[PDB]
Design a protein around this ligand. Structure first.
Ligand code: CLA
Ligand code: CLA
Ligand code: CLA
Ligand code: CLA
Ligand code: CLA
Ligand code: CLA
Ligand code: CLA
Ligand code: CLA
Ligand SMILES: CCCCCCCCCCCCCCCC(=O)OC[C@H](COP(=O)(O)OC[C@@H](O)CO)OC(=O)CCCCCCCCCCCCCCC
Ligand SMILES: CC1=C(/C=C/C(C)=C/C=C/C(C)=C\C=C\C=C(C)\C=C\C=C(C)\C=C\C2=C[C@H](C)[C@H](O)CC2(C)C)C(C)(C)C[C@@H](O)C1
Ligand code: SF4
Ligand code: SF4
Ligand code: SF4
Lengths: 729, 75, 139, 75, 40, 142, 75, 31, 80
């Protein structure tokens, strides 16, 4: 059989497994038949072009559907009272009740309500009309076409890059720092000052008249004469109304700090100076490494020079290890991307940048949950692909006595102390929670163990939170740090001391307990991933694991039993802990913000100290409207979310039987079914081409994990959206 | 709780736990406090039995508490 | 070619399938010293007759399981069974025992196969053989 | 008894027949099967035969009991 | 199933192809390709 | 000025309102009054329940420091007696049998000698036989 | 006397003896397979009902699997 | 103001180009 | 088909050959051990990968190792 063309051993398989594994190893280019390094790199280049084109097409589709079936031009007239529309509904399976229920947001047909928060983003960046959205969609279509053609071209024989071109770290770093990061940020700052701010102040600026409309009145002379302060004079007053000329200043680069009084979001001019400054810094950074002139650093000598007397060989030979190994680079990139996605979530829920996005609680919750889940997935993938590197691309002799080898030396100490910290957190956190539960249940909630989060409150004070009376640093009015004449200090101190936003929310004993539980989850997931990565090469039970690859089922029932001794199994186990930690995180965030938005912070404050309050006040209480989306009486707009809630519960349940029941049972059952088919008249005329067999052990684990994760995500998303929409939306 | 706890044993295998016990045994050996009875991860059959036992216990206890509370609270 | 009266069996649903007439089947023959009851690997009990016997099974594992039962669970031990592979065209390939001596005991004239001149810990690192269609044990 | 009683009684029938199927497959196929033709010699309580034959996890009769316990709980 | 957006007749015809025609054609082509014996 | 959000329980209106109806934990009829008295000196939140402050300050040493010292002493006692009994039985002929069948005489002899566990531990560390060398411990392949 | 009006006692008794019955049935399904593995001897079972059961076991399991699928699907 | 039918049809026609380019890229990558 | 390798740490106890249910292994004369015999895998195309030979090996690490590879009808041990 032809398929799969990249693996002969799979193509000669006569069973249905050939269909499955061929899918699973399709995009693993290294293990393909007759694969060279150069071909691998070029194929990766083309595939990355493809993913970029897919991203651009997805964004174009978002824009086009919003412009076509949305209410963008009506939404901007009243962002605080109109639900944005995602896309239209066309379902012949609908009934009259569903049609009436889903005709919402002033539409004339069944429509969905957008929760990605793209309306606020488009409004903030200056898009105000449907035709602008349409032009953006068409331009993104053209851009995706260009990138697809670029992939095809650089895949052609005359345009195939050489191996040396791919292994040019210095030139890539210089171009991608100064150009990709710096020039793009500078262009965004120029877009903000030339277009976004004038449109926010009522002046319409487009391609038609942006050449005849200067950003600043006395423009482009002070920048070259050095009198930059002119661009900071006359900022937007506190009475400014977004999108109008009432109370609007003329400054284009400010450091006001805090939030816009009306939109409850960061000042646009602050964003302009911020992106300009980081563009300048990135452009400076991009002139660091030597490419083909005399000046510039070289990464290899920097790495080979930083060696100490305690670590042995230090960072020697690390340049070759990183450059020759693609999995090392992928793991580093995934770790960094996950960290900065977590950063995006944490600094975006507390410092909103888009106008009126702080008042749309549903979109805020959705965005936080989404980007935090993405960050968790990326953080898991970093460790997984690092373990893959250790299995495949790690050379012990080359990286001898350096830090990479030193990691595998005290790996037992690493795992032991990690196990100790995980157990130490878990025991004394579960003990405190159960103690509070038991004490509260016995009718004496006064004997609870409530620890004030003193250190985090001290940090809040050091940033300027004057509620705990710590009187330290920025909270100290006489401290040198608070008497530097910083232009952002008044606005920042005003915003931090206001209780109307999420900027440094007040904390208590429940936040202490839940943050320590999150710490337990993080350390346990790290323990699983790290032990898998370090034991991937081998352990006492399997000294020769590297010979068996990264993912293998087991080594049989002998020598104890094996049963998930591979590093792929470590990743598979760590996915569950990642999901559990993300669940705790999102539960804490959502309940705290429900209390904040309703003004009933005391409910969370006094009910989060014991687990029964979590079970009753959060889960039981907030499901009242969700599960009533469709009743024996009728149907409301939350019907789809109730259906998806049950759907997620069902898929989560279904994953359990790929996770618990194992292969031999189903193999024998399929044997019986095969007998039944072969012995049946009028069905013997039809025969299979691939012999039906049960799913393999690793495939079964993967499928169970997939159903599990899909159910988890769908259930929580449905519950969160339904609860927040019913409460506030 | 116990139901969820059972998912430790049903969803996992014993090689992971054996390697973890190897690391912990190294830890206890560094301090010369290693036990004479060498610790081992539970067998595959024992793991399945423990998982099913704790699972059934948790589920049945949940149903028992729910039923008794509801039936004593309905007069 | 292959001779022997089939053991008296009532027939079961666990026997051969289309693979026997499409891909191959297996045959086991042995000499019984008395007509006595033995256990079908496919389910059930059947009596084997005095003298030659011949049985068709679907897998080599089933034939070797029957051979193990014959060798272990009968006081007049049956050590003379022979297992052949029968192709749909008609070719019969002698499989077990290979040279007439059981593989458990060493017999001269055999050739070592799959034997490596090193120990398990001396296998080459994967990174030194990557991008070639080889595995550390294959080297 | 109405429509709901009809549905629930036939659901009961479905669950009971499935549990009976699991336990009957355990009892009948405990001696041997087309996959493993000598399970009787391996014993009644063994975890598997190995990763070969595509994977032979949970083939013993004890594993069939372990699987039937959950379905009894469900029913 | 009835909409007030511009060119409301498009989903009347586009969705079925994405619903039936495209999935069926893709099923057939992939099934033929993965099952085409030989030549690789 | 520390803990501006935490007030003394002796004046917090919520604590005083809720301390009248404190339940009796034991058969003693005035255990609730004793609990209210003992908790009136703590730092109550807006909901009237005592809060424990753990930052190192000695004014609130009773919250963490004293129980910490008590637990550390007891846990060190337990660990030291266990380790000493293990090392002692390791020189016998059936160390595993004495693991399941406890040598109660020797067990209690080690039980009663654990109150000086800090001095024994520091002498052990200085003698160098508290911690084994890395080259004398079995290790898994890297 | 006075048991029907005590709804809690009714529910508790029903559920308790229900669970006991389910567990005992599963135990039957287990110890029957134990007998088949250990105490079953083919010599004493020739063309008797046990052997005939062991002969059309594939048909039994296939038809039972089909009826389980049909019941679950339709209900 | 809301779009027109001609705009939607033109968007479809424009998107017909990246479809052809993506087909070419997929065929090239399969090779 | 799967691969079966025998390394020079074999002591010739013949347990692996006895444990093999599909007659894949054989005992050949040798000189490296006291028993002067080593295991071999001539009929490796019939191996299913049950790892019984690995379970039977008493050396500190298995002198016989099985590496699962391409899957055939025989390797899957199918009867249909
Ligand atoms: C990936 C982006 C994306 C997505 C998810 C959707 C989603 C949808 N569109 Mg849509 N659309 C998009 C981009 C997108 N659109 C773009 C860019 C255009 C301009 C050409 C349109 C033009 C369009 C029209 C004219 C109509 C829809 C309709 C619909 C709905 C019916 C389902 C469907 O797509 O089939 C029908 C729609 C198409 C087949 C449009 C072609 C798809 C685009 C052009 C290419 C996307 C390729 C994509 C990246 C492939 C990813 C591969 C990956 C899955 C592996 C659904 C909500 C219908 C609707 O409103 O029903 C209520 C409808 O009538 N779309
Ligand atoms: C019988 C049940 C049923 C069915 C058939 C549908 C069908 C539909 N609903 Mg719907 N709905 C239902 C019940 C149902 N609904 C219920 C009970 C509710 C709650 C009241 C809703 C609420 C609802 C809303 C709110 C919306 C719909 C929409 C839609 C349409 C989406 C178009 C589509 O699927 O293309 C897109 C197809 C896909 C995205 C495929 C995804 C599934 C596969 C498995 C993923 C692909 C995996 C893999 C890569 C496949 C490879 C390729 C393959 C060929 C091999 C479609 C007509 C939407 C609509 O009208 O917009 C057009 C919409 O907005 N429905
Ligand atoms: C100035 C020259 C230049 C530029 C612009 C690029 C640009 C790019 N190269 Mg590149 N490259 C260059 C020179 C350059 N290269 C040279 C000289 C070499 C040879 C040494 C290479 C060799 C090379 C290789 C080998 C590869 C690339 C690839 C890529 C693409 C990766 C996708 C990406 O990062 O974008 C997306 C990311 C960004 C735009 C910035 C990252 C986002 C930041 C970090 C955080 C987010 C900021 C902000 C908050 C997010 C916006 C929020 C908003 C949505 C609201 C990208 C388009 C890859 C590819 O295949 O692409 C086709 C690839 O594999 N390059
Ligand atoms: C830029 C990101 C990136 C890139 C380029 C790669 C690249 C690679 N990874 Mg990697 N990985 C990543 C992120 C990434 N990964 C992350 C974030 C994780 C953590 C989840 C992993 C976890 C991971 C593992 C555990 C493994 C790889 C492997 C691989 C290699 C090839 C196998 C493969 O993934 O194809 C095959 C991929 C698939 C078959 C994916 C199937 C899963 C589908 C998409 C789920 C679909 C869900 C379903 C449709 C939901 C429907 C919903 C509906 C009902 C509504 C390849 C080098 C494998 C390897 O070792 O190769 C060297 C391997 O074992 N990766
Ligand atoms: C609610 C369920 C639950 C619980 C409590 C645990 C608990 C634990 N898991 Mg775990 N796990 C679970 C579900 C759970 N897991 C699931 C579903 C998976 C996916 C398969 C995993 C996967 C997993 C992996 C992969 C790993 C863990 C690890 C751990 C340990 C880390 C230490 C810790 O968190 O606190 C400390 C422990 C606790 C607080 C639990 C003790 C709770 C009891 C009540 C204490 C008292 C015992 C009691 C007196 C006994 C009386 C019994 C008697 C009545 C018969 C711990 C034992 C890691 C580990 O071993 O770390 C060393 C590890 O490597 N688990
Ligand atoms: C993905 C896109 C999609 C679309 C556009 C439809 C559209 C439709 N489905 Mg449907 N369906 C879908 C996916 C889809 N389905 C999926 C994925 C499932 C599996 C869960 C089903 C399962 C399903 C059932 C079980 C039934 C429908 C029925 C129907 C029709 C009811 C409306 C009507 O007036 O009936 C009458 C409409 C016609 C007579 C027009 C026939 C359409 C053309 C002419 C056929 C050629 C309608 C044409 C019903 C039906 O077929 O009614 C007859 C019905 O009983 N659907
Ligand atoms: C960052 C974590 C941290 C750590 C490790 C410590 C550690 C310590 N603090 Mg401490 N403290 C912290 C944060 C921390 N503090 C913060 C954030 C505050 C402000 C609320 C204080 C306010 C504080 C006071 C007021 C006092 C301590 C004291 C102490 C010491 C107690 C000595 C003892 O009993 O043993 C101990 C070294 C005591 C001291 O001076 O010890 C010398 C003491 O009186 N702490
Ligand atoms: C009349 C009742 C009865 C009798 C006499 C037997 C007799 C026997 N059974 Mg059997 N069995 C029964 C009912 C019975 N069984 C039922 C109802 C089931 C279904 C659950 C089983 C399932 C079963 C299996 C699966 C196995 C046996 C085995 C055995 C043999 C002894 C080994 C054994 O289980 O002891 C050892 C017993 C234990 C270790 C039980 C201790 C652990 C239990 C489960 C904990 C219970 C906890 C409790 C409910 C709540 C505590 C809460 C906690 C917080 C305090 C023996 C022939 C074994 C065998 O093969 O023998 C040939 C075997 O493998 N039985
Ligand atoms: C907030 C998180 C806090 C917990 C995270 C992890 C806690 C782990 C702390 C244990 C000590 C780590 C091992 C020390 C590591 C060790 O001692 O390496 C020796 C190293 C001294 O390095 P040298 O100056 O010899 O040279 C190192 C470099 O020159 C190149 O290797 O010490 C440090 O750098 C300590 C800081 C590491 C941080
Ligand atoms: C001797 C002994 C053993 C062994 C002991 C060993 C080997 C110990 C080894 C320890 C090592 C290697 C390292 C230890 C590190 C300890 C640290 C880092 C302590 C930190 C303390 C802090 C940060 C105090 C913090 C604040 C201190 C303050 C008083 C308040 O609260 C507030 C608060 C909590 C912030 C056993 C285990 C074998 C048996 C025992 O019985 C005895
Ligand atoms: S994973 Fe399955 S086949 Fe492998 S040892 Fe465990 S039970 Fe046996
Ligand atoms: S894995 Fe099984 S079939 Fe293969 S050689 Fe070893 S014992 Fe024989
Ligand atoms: S079991 Fe191991 S030591 Fe014994 S003969 Fe086989 S390979 Fe050699």
């Amino acid at each position: 059989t032809k398929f799969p063309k990249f693996s002969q051993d799979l193509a000669q398989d006569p069973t249905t497994r050939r269909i499955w594994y061929g899918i699973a190893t399709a995009h693993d280019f290294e293990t393909h038949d007759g694969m060279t390094e150069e071909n691998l790199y070029q194929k990766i280049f083309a595939s990355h072009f493809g993913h970029i084109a897919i991203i651009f097409l997805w964004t174009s589709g978002t824009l086009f559907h919003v412009a076509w079936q949305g209410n963008f031009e009506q939404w901007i007239k009243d962002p605080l009272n109109i639900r944005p529309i995602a896309h239209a509904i066309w379902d012949p399976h609908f009934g009259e009740g569903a049609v009436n229920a889903f005709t919402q947001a002033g539409a004339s047909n069944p429509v969905n309500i957008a929760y990605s928060g793209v309306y606020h983003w488009f409004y903030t960046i200056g898009m105000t009309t449907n035709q602008e959205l349409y032009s953006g969609a068409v331009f993104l279509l053209v851009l995706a076409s260009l990138f697809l053609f670029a992939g095809w071209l650089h895949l052609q024989p005359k345009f195939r890059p050489s191996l040396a071109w791919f292994k040019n770290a210095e030139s890539r770093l210089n171009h991608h720092l100064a150009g990709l990061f710096g020039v793009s940020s500078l262009a965004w700052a120029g877009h903000l000052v030339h277009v976004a701010i004038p449109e926010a102040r009522g002046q319409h600026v487009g391609w038609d008249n942006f050449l005849s409309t200067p950003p600043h009145p006395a423009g482009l002379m002070p920048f070259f004469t050095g009198n930059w302060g002119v661009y900071a004079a006359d900022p937007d007053t506190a009475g400014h109304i977004f999108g109008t000329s009432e109370g609007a200043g003329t400054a284009i680069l400010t450091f006001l700090g805090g939030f816009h009084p009306q939109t409850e979001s960061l000042w646009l001019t602050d964003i302009a100076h911020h992106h300009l400054a980081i563009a300048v810094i990135f452009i400076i950074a991009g002139h660091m490494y030597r490419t083909n002139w005399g000046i510039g650093h070289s990464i290899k000598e920097i790495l080979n020079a930083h060696k100490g007397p305690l670590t042995g060989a230090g960072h020697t030979n690390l340049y070759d290890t990183i450059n020759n190994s693609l999995h090392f680079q992928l793991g580093l990139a995934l770790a960094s991307l996950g960290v900065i996605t977590s950063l995006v979530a944490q600094h975006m829920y507390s410092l909103p940048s888009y106008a009126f996005i702080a008042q749309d609680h549903t979109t805020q919750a959705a965005l936080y949950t989404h980007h935090q889940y993405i960050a968790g997935f990326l953080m898991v993938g970093a460790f997984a692909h690092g373990a893959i590197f250790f299995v495949r691309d790690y050379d012990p002799v080359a990286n001898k006595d350096n830090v990479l080898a030193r990691m595998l030396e005290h790996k037992e100490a690493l795992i032991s102390h990690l196990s100790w910290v995980s157990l130490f957190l878990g025991f004394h956190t579960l003990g405190l929670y159960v103690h509070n539960d038991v004490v509260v249940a016995f009718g004496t909630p006064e004997k609870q163990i409530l620890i004030e989060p003193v250190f985090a409150q001290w940090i809040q004070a050091t940033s300027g939170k004057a509620l705990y009376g710590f009187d330290v640093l920025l909270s100290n009015p006489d401290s040198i740090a608070s008497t530097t004449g910083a232009a952002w200090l008044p606005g920042w101190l005003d915003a931090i001391n206001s209780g109307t936003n999420s900027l440094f929310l007040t904390i208590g004993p429940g936040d202490f307990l839940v943050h320590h539980a999150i710490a337990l989850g993080l350390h346990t997931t790290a323990l699983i991933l790290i032990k898998g990565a370090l034991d991937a090469r081998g352990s006492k039970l399997m000294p020769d694991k590297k010979d068996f690859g990264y993912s293998f089922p087991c080594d049989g029932p002998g020598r104890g039993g094996t049963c998930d001794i591979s590093a792929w199994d470590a990743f598979y186990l760590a996915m569950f802990w990642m999901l559990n930690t993300l669940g705790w995180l999102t539960f804490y965030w959502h309940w705290k913000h429900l209390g904040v938005w309703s003004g009933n912070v005391a409910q969370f404050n006094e009910n989060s100290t014991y687990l029964m309050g979590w079970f009753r006040d959060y889960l039981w209480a907030n499901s009242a409207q969700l599960i009533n989306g469709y009743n024996p009486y009728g149907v409301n707009n939350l019907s789809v979310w109730a259906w998806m809630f049950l759907f997620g519960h069902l898929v989560w349940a279904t994953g359990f039987m790929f996770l618990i029941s194992w292969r031999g049972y189903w193999q024998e059952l399929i044997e019986t079914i095969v007998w039944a088919h072969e012995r049946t008249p009028l069905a013997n005329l039809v025969r299979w081409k691939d012999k039906p067999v049960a799913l393999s052990i690793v495939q079964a684990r993967l499928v169970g994990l997939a159903h599990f994760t899909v159910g988890y995500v769908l259930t929580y998303a449905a519950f969160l959206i339904a609860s927040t929409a019913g409460k506030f939306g | 709780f116990v139901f969820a706890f059972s998912l430790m044993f049903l969803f996992s295998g014993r090689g992971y736990w054996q390697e973890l016990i190897e690391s912990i045994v190294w830890a206890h050996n560094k301090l010369n406090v290693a036990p004479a009875i060498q610790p081992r991860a539970l067998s595959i059959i024992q793991g399945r039995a423990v998982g099913v036992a704790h699972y059934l216990l948790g589920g049945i206890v949940t149903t028992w508490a729910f039923f008794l509370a509801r039936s004593l609270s309905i007069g | 070619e292959l001779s022997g009266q089939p053991p008296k069996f009532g027939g079961s649903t666990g026997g051969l399938l289309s693979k026997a007439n499409r891909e191959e089947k297996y045959a086991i023959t042995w000499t019984s010293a008395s007509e006595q009851v033995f256990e079908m690997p496919t389910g059930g009990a059947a009596i084997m007759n005095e003298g030659e016997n011949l049985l068709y099974l679907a897998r080599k594992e089933q034939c070797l399981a029957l051979g193990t039962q014959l060798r272990t669970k009968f006081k007049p031990k049956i050590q003379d069974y022979k297992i052949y592979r029968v192709y749909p065209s008609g070719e019969v390939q002698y499989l077990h025992p290979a040279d007439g001596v059981f593989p458990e005991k060493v017999n001269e004239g055999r050739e070592a196969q799959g034997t490596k001149t090193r120990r398990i810990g001396q296998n080459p690192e994967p990174v030194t053989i990557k991008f070639s269609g080889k595995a550390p044990y294959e080297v | 008894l109405g429509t709901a009683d009809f549905m629930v009684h036939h659901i009961h029938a479905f669950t009971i027949h499935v549990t009976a199927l699991i336990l009957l497959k355990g009892v009948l196929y405990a001696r041997s099967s087309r996959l493993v033709p000598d399970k009787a010699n391996l014993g009644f309580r063994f975890p598997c035969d190995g990763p070969g034959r595509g994977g032979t996890c949970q083939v013993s009769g004890w594993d069939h009991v372990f699987l039937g316990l959950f379905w009894m709980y469900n029913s | 199933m009835d909409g007030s957006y511009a060119a409301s007749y498009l989903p009347w015809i586009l969705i079925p192809m994405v619903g039936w025609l495209f999935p069926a054609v893709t099923m057939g082509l992939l099934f033929i390709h993965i099952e085409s014996e030989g030549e690789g | 000025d520390d803990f501006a959000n935490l007030t003394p329980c002796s004046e917090n209106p919520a604590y005083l309102a809720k301390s009248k109806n404190f339940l009796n934990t034991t058969n003693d009829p005035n255990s609730g009054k004793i609990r209210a008295e003992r908790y009136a000196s703590a730092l109550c939140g807006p909901e009237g329940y005592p809060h424990l402050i753990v930052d190192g300050r000695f004014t609130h040493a009773g919250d963490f420091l004293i129980p910490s010292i008590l637990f550390l002493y007891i846990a060190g006692w337990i660990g030291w007696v266990g380790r000493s009994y293990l090392i002692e039985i390791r020189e016998s002929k059936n160390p595993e049998m004495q693991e399941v069948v406890i040598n109660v005489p020797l067990a209690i002899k080690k039980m009663l000698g654990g109150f000086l566990w800090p001095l024994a531990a520091v002498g052990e560390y200085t003698s160098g036989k508290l911690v084994m060398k890395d080259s004398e411990i079995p290790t898994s392949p890297r | 006397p006075y048991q029907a009006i005590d709804y809690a006692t009714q529910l508790s008794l029903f559920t308790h003896h229900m669970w006991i019955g389910g567990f005992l049935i599963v135990g039957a399904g287990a110890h029957g397979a134990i007998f088949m593995v250990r105490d079953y001897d083919p010599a004493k079972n020739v063309n008797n009902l046990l052997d005939r059961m062991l002969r059309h076991r594939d048909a039994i399991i296939s038809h039972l699997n089909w009826v389980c699928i049909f019941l679950g699907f339709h209900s | 103001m809301a779009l027109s039918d001609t705009q939607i049809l033109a968007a479809l026609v424009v998107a017909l180009l990246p479809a052809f380019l993506a087909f070419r890229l997929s065929t090239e990558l399969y090779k | 088909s799967h691969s079966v390798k025998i390394y020079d740490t074999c002591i010739g106890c013949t347990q692996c050959v006895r444990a093999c249910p599909l007659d894949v292994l054989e005992m050949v004369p040798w000189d490296g051990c006291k028993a002067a015999q080593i295991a071999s895998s001539p009929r490796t195309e019939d191996c299913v990968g049950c790892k019984r030979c690995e379970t039977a090996c008493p050396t500190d690490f298995l002198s016989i190792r099985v590496y699962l590879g391409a899957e055939t009808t025989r390797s899957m041990g199918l009867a249909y």
